[PDB]
Design a protein around this ligand. Structure first.
Ligand code: N8A
Ligand code: ZN
Length: 257
């Protein structure tokens, strides 16, 4: 099964998922100088006031905080998007060291981690149908750098001991994802893919310019999770990031100058 180890990591994924060598794969390096400012890009609309988190799950490749997406409770609109996209889950990718961990890079710079808030286009009715469409998902990507703590992340950090191993889930209600957002919603955007198998080319990527800062203790607790299931040999869940993929025939647009 695919993973991030020596024999099943990202360079192996194309054998099971040939779209890995596709024309709109993610993540990518964001060359800030080559990104073009687009004045027709609208500001992003993040409407998270009514979000209903339900639980948190270790799926063996990251942990997902899952939301009730059966109504327009937490939605993303505006920006490059047409229509309304509902938040279904968020998760992170992170490194074994503070110097790596993000999937997107900015002028080749790697951040300590990257948060992905995953949304699906309501015109397709549910997530499973949306991922089959070229405009099915909008993923809001937010970089994490190590510095001061992010208070809004602590409730996530504190529950991770209850989902250490693959397959464990925990009730995780009343979590407000607004506590994970930076001050500015300036963004880059490009058409891309899921960054884990099945690598489907269904994502409008919206990557925020401004990182959030989290503490060293906060990211250290991510690194205590396990890829393995309980009662299997312990392999720390670290470096669960795919490296940058060829931009090919794509242009990254910026909402700011
Ligand atoms: N890392 S990412 O590009 O934000 C992202 C977002 C939503 C996703 O469903 C995935 N991929 C993922 O979760 N793979 C395991 C479950 C899955 C997801 C989609 C279709 C089939 N199976 C990646
Ligand atoms: Zn992701």
């Amino acid at each position: 099964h695919w993973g991030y180890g020596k024999h099943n990591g990202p360079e192996h994924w194309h054998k099971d998922f040939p779209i890995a060598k596709g024309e709109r794969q993610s993540p990518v390096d964001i060359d800030t100088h080559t990104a073009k400012y687009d004045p027709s890009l609208k500001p992003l609309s993040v409407s998270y006031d009514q979000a209903t988190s339900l639980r948190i799950l270790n799926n063996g490749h990251a942990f997902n905080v899952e939301f009730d997406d059966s109504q327009d409770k937490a939605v993303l609109k505006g920006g490059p998007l047409d229509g309304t996209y509902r938040l279904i889950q968020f998760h992170f990718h992170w490194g074994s060291l503070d110097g790596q961990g993000s999937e997107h890079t900015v002028d080749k710079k790697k951040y300590a981690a990257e948060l992905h808030l995953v949304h699906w286009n309501t015109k397709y009715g549910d997530f499973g149908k949306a991922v089959q469409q070229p405009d099915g998902l909008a993923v809001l990507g937010i970089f994490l750098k190590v510095g001061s703590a992010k208070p809004g992340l602590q409730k996530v950090v504190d529950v991770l001991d209850s989902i250490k191993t693959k397959g464990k889930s925990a009730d995780f209600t009343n979590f407000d994802p607004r506590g994970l957002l930076p001050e500015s919603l300036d963004y880059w955007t490009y058409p891309g893919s899921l960054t884990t198998p099945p690598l489907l080319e269904c994502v409008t990527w919206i990557v925020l310019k401004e990182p959030i800062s989290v503490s060293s203790e906060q990211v250290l607790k991510f690194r205590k999770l396990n890829f393995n299931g309980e009662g299997e040999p312990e392999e720390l869940m670290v470096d669960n990031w795919r490296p940058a993929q060829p931009l090919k025939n794509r242009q990254i647009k910026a909402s700011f100058k």
